[model samples]
Target: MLKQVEIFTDGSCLGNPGPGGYGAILRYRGREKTFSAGYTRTTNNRMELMAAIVALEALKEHCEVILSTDSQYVRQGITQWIHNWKKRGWKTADNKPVKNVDLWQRLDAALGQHQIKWEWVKGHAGHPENERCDELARAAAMNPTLEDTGYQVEV
Candidate 1:
């Protein structure tokens, strides 16, 4: 039988290429897990991709995950365009090199280990958990704390 899991993820960068943080909340069965981390310098896209990677990697092994994010880049890249990029050695559709290939590769690998369904959600749209994730991400970016916000499930 497949176990159902849902994750809400958000990432924030203080100044586009400045201090950044990522947060994710994972719910499975009756358990919940939250993970957040900060970086000294990064971009918003990096943080967004990192948040998804962190959430998916938290699982022990194979599991079904409904991963939600506000990042169209992350969602569309993985679901609609990653294959072509991989076929072309990670080059962009414009024939230019892809940015953040390293992080994208990491995210791709982590995702490959799970059965994942991606959903796009509006950021700051009054969704409770998504709002909380935004708060956690922004707080981590400001305070530089990498603590788990009491949200996770032990597999």
Candidate 2:
């Protein structure tokens, strides 16, 4: 049986196209790993989805994971609607092209390789790891840094 893992993720964009950042926390068997990163230019939605993608990509093969994020775009897309959108050739409910197709496609591929369950959480709530991820994301967005905080992984 695969061990069940839980992760919390968040992201921030200083000015929608300005500096951006993502944060994630993976937990399993009472152990935790945290990750954060800053980008020169990006969107919040991208960072939000990227955070979860990075988290899952860091896990071992065949690990069962439950990923939580505060972004509705990330949670809803992965959990409730992505397959339909893909079936429709990446068009949305309004018959429009998806805004962040690049990141969505990357996230979709990464998710396809993992056993994952996506969950949405309320931001600024009392969830400890979620709050920490929020802080990490916001701080990175406010201050761009070259220091890597284990945000990326080699797959």
Candidate 3:
């Protein structure tokens, strides 16, 4: 049986395609670990995906994870849309290329070792962990230090 873990995540951006950050809190048993990172240029959705990707990648062993996020794009994209997106060669139903394809692909690979359940929480609703993650993300965004190489200005 795999160890059970819980993760709460959030993302922030100063502006669309501007500085961004992702924060994640991981809980195993009763211990908790928190992580956050900033990017020079990225979107909110990419930050959201990064929060999850980093958390999953931090696990040293395969486990069952319950991951909660405030972004529907992250949860629904991964759990629901990714299936058809994969079948359609990573294109959308309208035959347009999917947005945030790089982060989505990274997230897909990060999921390989774990059994994860995705959950969506309403943002800024006073949920403690979500609130804390929001704080961390916003703070990190203000001090961005890394470039988001995959980010491209949408036409």
| Ordered list by lDDT, greatest first | 3, 1, 2
Off by over 4 Å in 1: 93-97, 124-126, 145-155
Q: Please provide, for model 3 over 1-155, each residue's C-alpha lDDT reduced to its tens digit, 9 standing for 90 to 100.
A: 22679899999999987899988999975689899999988889889888988888888888889888888788788668988888888887677778888888888888888898877788756369988999999999999999888887862
lDDT of 2 by residue, 40-153 (tens): 777787788879878877766667778777798876776677888889999877777777776778778777876877666777563788889989999988877643222322
Better of 1 and 2 by TM-score: 1
Model 1, residue 45: distance off in Å is 0.6
Query: Which pairs, if any, clash in model 1?
Result: 32-151, 32-152, 32-153, 33-151, 33-152, 34-151, 34-152
Flag regions of model 3 displaced more than 4 Å: 1-3, 93-96
Clashing pairs in 2: none
Q: Which of 2 and 3 is the better model by lDDT?
A: 3
Give a tens-digit lDDT track for model 1, residues 71-155: 8778778778888888999887677667777777888889888888877887656358888888888887886644322211210
TM, every model: 0.83, 0.80, 0.89
Which residue runs does candidate 2 get wrong by more than 4 Å?
Answer: 28-31, 92-97, 145-155
Write down the worst ten-residue block by lDDT for model 2: 146-155
